[PDB]
Amino acid sequence: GDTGSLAGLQAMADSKYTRAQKKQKMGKIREMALKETALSVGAQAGLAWRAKIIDEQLNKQARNLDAIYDFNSLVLEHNILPPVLLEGRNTLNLADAQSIRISDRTYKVAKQAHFITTPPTWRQYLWMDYVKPEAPNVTLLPKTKAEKEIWCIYTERGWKNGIDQANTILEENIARIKEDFGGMILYRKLLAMNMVSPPYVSHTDLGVTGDGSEIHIDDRVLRITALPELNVNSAEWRAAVAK
Template sequence: MRGGEQSFRSLLLVILLLFSGFSLFISYPSFAATAAEDDRPPSLESLQNIEAGGEEKQEVGFQVRVEAQKEAALSYGLRGGLAWRTNEINKRLGRFSDPLSRTYDFRQLLMSAPGGVYVEPPVIEEQLEALQIADQGQSAALTDKVLTISANARLVTTARDWRNYLIRDWGKPESPPDVLLPKTDEERKNWKEWVKEGWKSGIEQADDTFAEDMARLSRDFTGMVRYRKLLAQAIVSAPYAGLVERGVTGGGLEMRIGDRAVTITGPAQLKNQSDVWRPISISQPQ
């Protein structure tokens, strides 16, 4: 199973490398737009060139206006960059849909439960070569391996999907109020610079979010695979799901016939009785 964990890490590395290279040449979008692209997030240029649609009805102090305009432009650019970059990431992920679905196949990890539902395995994290200093540096605890159940088993009707982790949609950024949009050449110049600055921050935020989502996906899937391995070795117990037949319940305006309840009454537990552990035999290829 360790080879399987290595393959997960390898796929993660390949995807992150692809996206890091991707960022070198798509940090800014093409400004050519067609009618078929109306649903795409707006480009940097369109955010930079936005103008007020009518007369400004309320005068504000010059310095107050500059500061408010800067905040609006930075926020507008950030939200635009975040939405645009996320859309590009989603498109790139679509090209990796098949290998991602094969690698992160949560369906194979589900366990049957009464009542037609499934038990999703717990997530078990592993830390190797753990060291803990105690007693103000007077003692140290050294551990070869630390196992932690970071997420308990739960009842589900369907398996998770990598898209639940990686696909995001921020929608199109809402335009700032007309009163804050640029009206003079000087304001237009400043507006473009501020929007560009915010746009860069938005792209960085989208990339950071994707990296975090990818790490969370890999952690959860690897943790569930680790649980199945440890279960086969009798190092962890299986969660127990019980079915209770409640017959006819309710009444009045609503009544349920053949009502049943499924509950996890015994969560998975790590077993410290090492004498009952058993090794997994792995056949070697001929």
């Protein structure tokens, strides 16, 4: 080789290495498709099997998920989903030269609060989707033992890749629901801190409504009049203490 390049070049000065590489040259032009197929089917099988395993593992621990993610404690009093907030500490931005901008803390509303009919769950945030493929399609096949061996090890590599793919998807979903619950509890703490306006509602009531043919005996119409938002006058704020 070119590592000990003087010895390798004096070795390749002999023509035996050239004719030795000639026999593997035709093999070296062929096996890339076999490598691609091995990687693809390894990715498919590993992703499917790992997704099924992780779905069984997730559903095994179902009770503690509901124990930790009680939305019904955070459901507001008019059956209202709380809004979502985000914070930032020690903001540093370089716009360009001759310009810097820093802040201590900053806050941002992510999703505006709205009505609900049900509290959510962790399933639509966390359930990995699973479908078994029962038809492993094969176009090309190995012919000799070396091709079979490299086929096996490349399918092992694809298997590992599919495992990593499934794990990355799962942890991204974990981070998503972590973001959501952190924003909800942040709204709860800031509302208890008097940093945001509470939502304000109006309810109107009408009696028997309708014509002489079809009726309803009562009518309650409820409109969220004042959306929550933060307070910009800071003198109306309160601090904390402990013992």
